[PDB]
């Protein structure tokens, strides 16, 4: 399948060159450069680009372009997920994937890419097995290696690879037996100029940070399972039992882990937490106008809204803009016509708002619409979906680990028309 991988910055420079089958001429990246040039933004790059003798399938993430090369017919989903997984693993081993993170650790990343992809075929893909084939670049491990000649490369195939549960290494012990679960929900929503509900939904996903020792069998169940539909399930779950018992009985692996994801049925109205008062004036060919926005909580379920940020992409008519925020921070970059306001927190004693005058372009006609309003927000200790856990039983081990769960709602793709 995959012949080679080029890691190219948004700059236009080629940093990490890899090859698996045959030496692909670097000239093939010229086609990517041209296609990038034709588009209006880095974000507009196609994922499938055709060249006279190669195909390029690309991912965009974290200001780095990952272009691979293919010469045979391969399903696009396969390549796109393998590339997104190499990105994810880079995040896991280095916090994030950046040209600095790559170039600072060239040898380890080349070894990693060698281990993962073999002749363009998947060899090692699971997180935990990759953790034991090559160790993370821990500085204490580095000084230990320098002292004793110890190696970052293992010499024994981890037993989990040949086990009936290939997703977790066996024989892991911790003195601090504990496990954390994270149910995060996002409110996808479109709101019109009238404040009505255009289309909204809740996207929910369960994360699980597990620090259990031994071979535990964890069970996750919920008070209100009927609210769960179209639920996702990692290989670690036993699908048959969920279909029969409606129970999440499973063997979680080590380390950070995304457990299941879900959406909320459209049958139940999505509780929109935040409303807005909004007003902008655009007189035709006028040099100045007015801007008025007022953020308000509509259904907070009695909980505070925090971490609020409002971003607007102003039209070309805008030159500068004279406003005063009631709180947070007011920032405006005239080059990209981007209106960013850090709102932060909402106090019931006074609703935060942003108002003032807009320094427009004289002689420039009024834009045909007001750019829509996107807003970020976070609610702690509250899941708008109303999903609740039932119990967390354990089997196969004797300890009683620290058990806890959180419910944090973070704003989804929340956009307000105006």
């Amino acid at each position: 399948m995959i012949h080679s991988l080029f890691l190219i910055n948004c700059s236009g420079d080629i940093f990490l060159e890899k090859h698996w089958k045959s030496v692909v001429s670097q000239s093939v990246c010229d086609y990517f450069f041209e296609a990038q040039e034709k588009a209006a933004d880095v974000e507009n790059v196609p994922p499938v680009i055709s060249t006279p003798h190669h195909y390029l399938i690309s991912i965009y993430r974290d200001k780095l372009f990952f272009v691979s090369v293919i010469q045979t017919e391969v399903p696009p989903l396969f390549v796109i997920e393998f590339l997104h997984r190499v990105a994810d693993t880079f995040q896991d081993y280095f916090g994030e994937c950046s040209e600095a993170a790559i170039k600072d650790n060239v040898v380890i990343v080349y070894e990693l890419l060698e281990e993962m992809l073999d002749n363009g075929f998947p060899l090692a893909t699971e997180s935990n097995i990759l953790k034991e084939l090559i160790k993370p670049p821990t500085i204490l491990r580095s000084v230990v290696n320098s002292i004793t000649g110890s190696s970052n490369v293992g010499d024994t195939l981890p037993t989990g690879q040949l086990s009936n549960i290939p997703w977790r290494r066996a024989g892991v012990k911790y003195t601090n037996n504990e496990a954390y679960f994270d149910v995060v929900e996002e409110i996808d929503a479109i709101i019109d100029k009238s404040g009505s509900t255009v289309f909204a939904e809740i996207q929910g996903v369960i994360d699980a940070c597990i620090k259990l020792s031994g071979m535990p069998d964890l069970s996750l169940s919920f008070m209100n399972p009927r609210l769960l539909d179209d639920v996702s399930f990692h290989p670690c779950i036993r699908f048959k039992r969920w279909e029969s018992e409606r129970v999440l009985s499973f063997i979680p692996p080590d380390g950070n882990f995304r457990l299941i994801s879900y959406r909320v049925s459209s049958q139940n109205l999505v509780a929109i937490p935040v409303y807005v008062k909004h007003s902008i004036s655009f007189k035709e060919n006028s040099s100045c106008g007015r801007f008025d926005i007022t953020i308000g909580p509509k259904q907070n379920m009695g909980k505070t809204i925090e971490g609020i940020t409002v971003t607007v992409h102003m039209p070309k008519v805008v030159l500068n803009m004279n406003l005063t925020p009631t709180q947070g921070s007011y920032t405006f970059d005239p080059v990209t016509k981007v209106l960013t306001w850090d709102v932060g927190k909402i106090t019931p004693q006074k609703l935060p708002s942003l108002k003032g005058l807009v320094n427009l372009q004289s002689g420039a006609p009024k834009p045909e619409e007001n750019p829509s309003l996107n807003i970020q927000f976070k609610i702690q200790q509250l899941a708008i979906s109303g999903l609740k856990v039932n119990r967390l039983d354990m089997y196969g081990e004797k300890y009683k680990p620290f058990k806890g769960v959180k419910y944090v709602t973070k704003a989804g793709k929340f956009q307000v028309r105006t």
Binding site: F181, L392, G404, V405, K406
Partner: peptide
């Protein structure tokens, strides 16, 4: 680390 988590 255990802080902030509801008991289960």
């Amino acid at each position: 680390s255990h802080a902030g988590y509801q008991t289960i």
